[PDB]
Protein backbone atom coordinates (compact mmCIF):
# COMPACT_ATOMS: atom_id res chain seq x y z
CA UNK A 1 0.00 0.00 0.00
CA UNK A 2 2.13 2.93 1.29
CA UNK A 3 4.65 0.39 2.57
CA UNK A 4 5.41 -0.23 -1.11
CA UNK A 5 6.83 3.33 -1.40
CA UNK A 6 8.97 3.07 1.75
CA UNK A 7 10.82 0.04 0.37
CA UNK A 8 11.06 1.87 -2.92
CA UNK A 9 12.98 4.54 -1.02
CA UNK A 10 15.03 2.03 0.96
CA UNK A 11 16.01 0.31 -2.33
CA UNK A 12 16.92 3.68 -3.85
CA UNK A 13 19.13 5.18 -1.12
CA UNK A 14 20.64 1.95 0.32
CA UNK A 15 18.98 2.26 3.70
CA UNK A 16 16.97 0.73 6.47
CA UNK A 17 14.09 3.19 6.92
CA UNK A 18 11.82 3.25 9.96
CA UNK A 19 8.74 5.47 10.28
CA UNK A 20 5.95 5.89 12.84
CA UNK A 21 3.18 8.49 13.06
CA UNK A 22 0.81 7.73 15.96
CA UNK A 23 -2.89 7.27 15.28
CA UNK A 24 -5.21 10.21 15.94
CA UNK A 25 -8.99 10.26 16.22
CA UNK A 26 -9.20 11.04 12.49
CA UNK A 27 -6.30 9.12 10.86
CA UNK A 28 -4.80 5.62 10.79
CA UNK A 29 -1.33 4.93 12.23
CA UNK A 30 1.62 4.95 9.81
CA UNK A 31 4.14 2.21 10.64
CA UNK A 32 7.14 1.00 8.66
CA UNK A 33 9.85 -0.88 10.59
CA UNK A 34 8.11 0.75 13.53
CA UNK A 35 9.34 -1.54 16.33
CA UNK A 36 12.85 -2.20 15.13
CA UNK A 37 15.68 -0.68 17.11
CA UNK A 38 17.54 2.34 15.71
CA UNK A 39 20.22 4.40 17.47
CA UNK A 40 19.14 7.44 19.48
CA UNK A 41 22.14 9.48 18.45
CA UNK A 42 21.24 13.06 19.22
CA UNK A 43 17.46 12.59 19.37
CA UNK A 44 17.83 11.85 23.12
CA UNK A 45 18.87 15.47 23.71
CA UNK A 46 15.21 16.50 23.60
CA UNK A 47 13.76 14.21 26.34
CA UNK A 48 16.92 15.03 28.35
CA UNK A 49 15.96 18.71 28.61
CA UNK A 50 12.50 17.58 29.70
CA UNK A 51 14.09 15.35 32.36
CA UNK A 52 16.05 18.23 33.91
CA UNK A 53 12.98 20.44 33.60
CA UNK A 54 10.66 17.89 35.24
CA UNK A 55 12.67 17.31 38.39
CA UNK A 56 13.97 20.84 39.10
CA UNK A 57 12.48 24.30 39.74
CA UNK A 58 12.73 27.02 37.13
CA UNK A 59 15.26 28.85 39.33
CA UNK A 60 17.56 25.88 38.66
CA UNK A 61 17.91 27.28 35.10
CA UNK A 62 20.12 30.04 36.53
CA UNK A 63 22.64 27.74 38.22
CA UNK A 64 26.05 28.30 36.65
CA UNK A 65 28.19 25.38 35.48
CA UNK A 66 31.94 25.59 34.88
CA UNK A 67 34.02 23.22 32.78
CA UNK A 68 37.48 22.57 31.35
CA UNK A 69 38.98 22.22 27.89
CA UNK A 70 39.27 18.51 28.75
CA UNK A 71 35.46 18.23 28.98
CA UNK A 72 35.00 19.30 25.34
CA UNK A 73 34.98 15.94 23.54
CA UNK A 74 32.29 16.04 20.78
CA UNK A 75 30.91 18.51 18.22
CA UNK A 76 30.30 21.51 20.47
CA UNK A 77 29.88 24.85 18.68
CA UNK A 78 28.57 26.69 21.77
CA UNK A 79 30.59 25.15 24.61
CA UNK A 80 33.95 26.18 23.08
CA UNK A 81 32.96 29.87 23.14
CA UNK A 82 32.27 30.07 26.90
CA UNK A 83 35.02 27.80 28.22
CA UNK A 84 36.25 30.74 30.36
CA UNK A 85 32.92 32.10 31.69
CA UNK A 86 30.92 28.84 31.98
CA UNK A 87 27.29 28.35 30.96
CA UNK A 88 24.17 28.21 33.06
CA UNK A 89 21.92 25.16 33.17
CA UNK A 90 19.38 27.12 31.12
CA UNK A 91 21.86 28.12 28.42
CA UNK A 92 22.94 24.49 28.08
CA UNK A 93 19.30 23.54 27.41
CA UNK A 94 19.08 26.09 24.59
CA UNK A 95 22.49 24.99 23.23
CA UNK A 96 21.70 21.27 23.43
CA UNK A 97 18.43 21.51 21.48
CA UNK A 98 19.01 24.25 18.84
CA UNK A 99 22.64 23.52 17.94
CA UNK A 100 22.83 19.84 18.99
CA UNK A 101 25.75 20.71 21.28
CA UNK A 102 27.37 17.44 22.26
CA UNK A 103 29.10 18.89 25.32
CA UNK A 104 25.97 20.47 26.85
CA UNK A 105 24.37 17.00 26.52
CA UNK A 106 27.17 15.40 28.55
CA UNK A 107 26.95 18.22 31.12
CA UNK A 108 23.14 18.00 31.44
CA UNK A 109 23.38 14.22 31.94
CA UNK A 110 25.81 14.81 34.82
CA UNK A 111 23.21 17.19 36.28
CA UNK A 112 20.82 14.24 36.50
CA UNK A 113 23.36 12.44 38.74
CA UNK A 114 23.51 8.72 39.34
CA UNK A 115 25.66 5.78 38.21
CA UNK A 116 27.66 5.92 35.00
CA UNK A 117 27.22 9.69 34.87
CA UNK A 118 23.44 10.06 34.55
CA UNK A 119 22.64 7.38 31.96
CA UNK A 120 20.99 5.22 34.59
CA UNK A 121 18.87 8.17 35.81
CA UNK A 122 17.93 9.11 32.25
CA UNK A 123 16.58 5.74 31.07
CA UNK A 124 14.84 5.65 34.42
CA UNK A 125 13.11 8.85 33.39
CA UNK A 126 11.85 7.42 30.09
CA UNK A 127 10.39 4.49 32.05
CA UNK A 128 8.15 6.93 34.00
CA UNK A 129 6.51 7.79 30.67
CA UNK A 130 5.79 4.09 29.96
CA UNK A 131 8.67 3.40 27.53
CA UNK A 132 10.24 0.07 28.47
CA UNK A 133 12.35 -0.39 25.30
CA UNK A 134 14.69 2.56 24.75
CA UNK A 135 17.93 2.74 26.67
CA UNK A 136 20.94 4.99 26.93
CA UNK A 137 24.19 3.35 27.97
CA UNK A 138 27.04 5.70 26.95
CA UNK A 139 27.78 9.45 26.72
CA UNK A 140 28.88 11.63 23.78
CA UNK A 141 30.49 10.92 21.43
CA UNK A 142 30.51 7.17 21.94
CA UNK A 143 26.72 6.84 21.99
CA UNK A 144 26.95 7.47 18.22
CA UNK A 145 29.31 4.54 17.47
CA UNK A 146 27.74 1.29 18.63
CA UNK A 147 27.95 -1.52 16.06
CA UNK A 148 24.84 -2.59 14.19
CA UNK A 149 22.97 -5.22 16.18
CA UNK A 150 24.05 -3.95 19.59
CA UNK A 151 21.08 -3.00 21.79
CA UNK A 152 23.00 -0.31 23.67
CA UNK A 153 21.95 3.34 23.10
CA UNK A 154 18.94 2.33 20.92
CA UNK A 155 15.28 3.36 20.65
CA UNK A 156 12.52 2.63 18.10
CA UNK A 157 10.33 4.95 15.99
CA UNK A 158 7.23 3.68 17.78
CA UNK A 159 8.84 4.28 21.17
CA UNK A 160 10.40 7.71 20.73
CA UNK A 161 7.25 9.06 18.99
CA UNK A 162 4.96 8.11 21.88
CA UNK A 163 7.40 9.75 24.34
CA UNK A 164 7.62 12.96 22.29
CA UNK A 165 3.82 13.06 22.00
CA UNK A 166 3.48 13.06 25.79
CA UNK A 167 6.13 15.79 26.08
CA UNK A 168 4.72 18.29 23.52
CA UNK A 169 1.03 17.50 23.10
CA UNK A 170 0.44 15.65 26.40
CA UNK A 171 0.63 16.05 30.17
CA UNK A 172 4.21 14.96 30.88
CA UNK A 173 5.11 18.56 31.86
CA UNK A 174 3.25 21.60 33.25
CA UNK A 175 2.70 24.40 30.72
CA UNK A 176 5.44 26.80 31.89
CA UNK A 177 8.12 24.14 31.45
CA UNK A 178 6.22 22.76 28.41
CA UNK A 179 6.50 26.06 26.48
CA UNK A 180 10.24 26.29 27.10
CA UNK A 181 10.80 22.91 25.43
CA UNK A 182 8.54 23.63 22.44
CA UNK A 183 10.10 27.04 21.75
CA UNK A 184 13.63 25.57 21.63
CA UNK A 185 12.58 22.76 19.24
CA UNK A 186 10.76 25.46 17.18
CA UNK A 187 13.96 27.53 16.66
CA UNK A 188 16.19 24.52 15.96
CA UNK A 189 18.92 25.16 13.40
CA UNK A 190 20.04 21.66 12.39
CA UNK A 191 17.04 20.06 10.66
CA UNK A 192 16.40 22.42 7.75
CA UNK A 193 17.04 19.69 5.14
CA UNK A 194 15.23 16.76 6.79
CA UNK A 195 11.57 16.59 7.92
CA UNK A 196 11.12 20.37 7.58
CA UNK A 197 12.15 20.10 3.90
CA UNK A 198 9.48 17.53 3.04
CA UNK A 199 6.29 19.33 4.29
CA UNK A 200 4.80 22.41 2.59
CA UNK A 201 5.65 25.73 4.14
CA UNK A 202 2.26 26.46 5.67
CA UNK A 203 2.77 23.44 7.97
CA UNK A 204 4.42 24.41 11.25
CA UNK A 205 7.31 22.11 12.15
CA UNK A 206 9.32 21.52 15.32
CA UNK A 207 12.00 18.82 15.29
CA UNK A 208 15.24 17.49 16.85
CA UNK A 209 17.80 15.71 14.64
CA UNK A 210 20.22 12.87 15.05
CA UNK A 211 23.33 11.85 13.06
CA UNK A 212 25.94 9.11 13.61
CA UNK A 213 28.10 6.46 11.94
CA UNK A 214 26.91 3.76 9.50
CA UNK A 215 25.02 6.51 7.68
CA UNK A 216 22.68 7.10 10.61
CA UNK A 217 20.37 10.10 10.19
CA UNK A 218 17.20 10.61 12.27
CA UNK A 219 14.59 13.32 12.77
CA UNK A 220 11.69 13.44 15.29
CA UNK A 221 9.07 16.12 14.81
CA UNK A 222 5.69 17.54 15.81
CA UNK A 223 3.77 19.17 12.93
CA UNK A 224 0.67 21.35 12.56
CA UNK A 225 -1.58 21.28 9.48
CA UNK A 226 -2.68 24.57 7.88
CA UNK A 227 -5.90 24.24 9.93
CA UNK A 228 -4.10 23.47 13.22
CA UNK A 229 -4.40 19.68 13.60
CA UNK A 230 -1.21 18.28 15.19
CA UNK A 231 0.58 15.04 14.33
CA UNK A 232 3.77 13.43 15.59
CA UNK A 233 6.33 12.12 13.04
CA UNK A 234 9.23 9.75 13.80
CA UNK A 235 11.78 9.09 11.00
CA UNK A 236 15.00 7.09 11.48
CA UNK A 237 17.55 5.48 9.15
CA UNK A 238 20.96 3.83 8.97
CA UNK A 239 23.02 2.22 6.21
CA UNK A 240 24.78 -0.65 7.99
CA UNK A 241 25.79 -2.45 4.79
CA UNK A 242 28.12 0.27 3.51
CA UNK A 243 30.45 0.08 6.53
CA UNK A 244 31.42 2.15 9.56
CA UNK A 245 32.29 5.24 7.48
CA UNK A 246 29.10 5.15 5.37
CA UNK A 247 27.70 8.58 4.43
CA UNK A 248 24.22 9.65 5.68
CA UNK A 249 21.65 10.61 3.08
CA UNK A 250 19.38 13.32 4.45
CA UNK A 251 17.36 13.59 1.23
CA UNK A 252 16.10 10.12 2.18
CA UNK A 253 14.34 11.52 5.28
CA UNK A 254 13.12 14.58 3.37
CA UNK A 255 11.42 12.37 0.79
CA UNK A 256 9.85 9.89 3.22
CA UNK A 257 8.33 12.88 5.04
CA UNK A 258 6.68 13.99 1.82
CA UNK A 259 5.12 10.51 1.66
CA UNK A 260 3.68 11.06 5.12
CA UNK A 261 2.31 14.46 4.11
CA UNK A 262 0.24 12.89 1.33
CA UNK A 263 -1.73 10.49 3.54
CA UNK A 264 -2.42 13.24 6.14
CA UNK A 265 -3.67 15.70 3.46
UniProtKB/TrEMBL annotation:
Domain annotation Beta-lactamase class A catalytic: ranges: 18-236
The principal location of this protein is periplasm
Q: How does it assemble?
A: Monomer.
What Gene Ontology molecular function terms does this protein carry? beta-lactamase activity
Say which family it is in: Belongs to the class-A beta-lactamase family.
Query: Which residues does UniProt call coiled coil?
Result: none
Reading the lineage from the top rank, the first entry is Bacteria
* Name of protein: Beta-lactamase
Q: Which GO terms are recorded in the biological process aspect for this UniProt protein?
A: beta-lactam antibiotic catabolic process; response to antibiotic
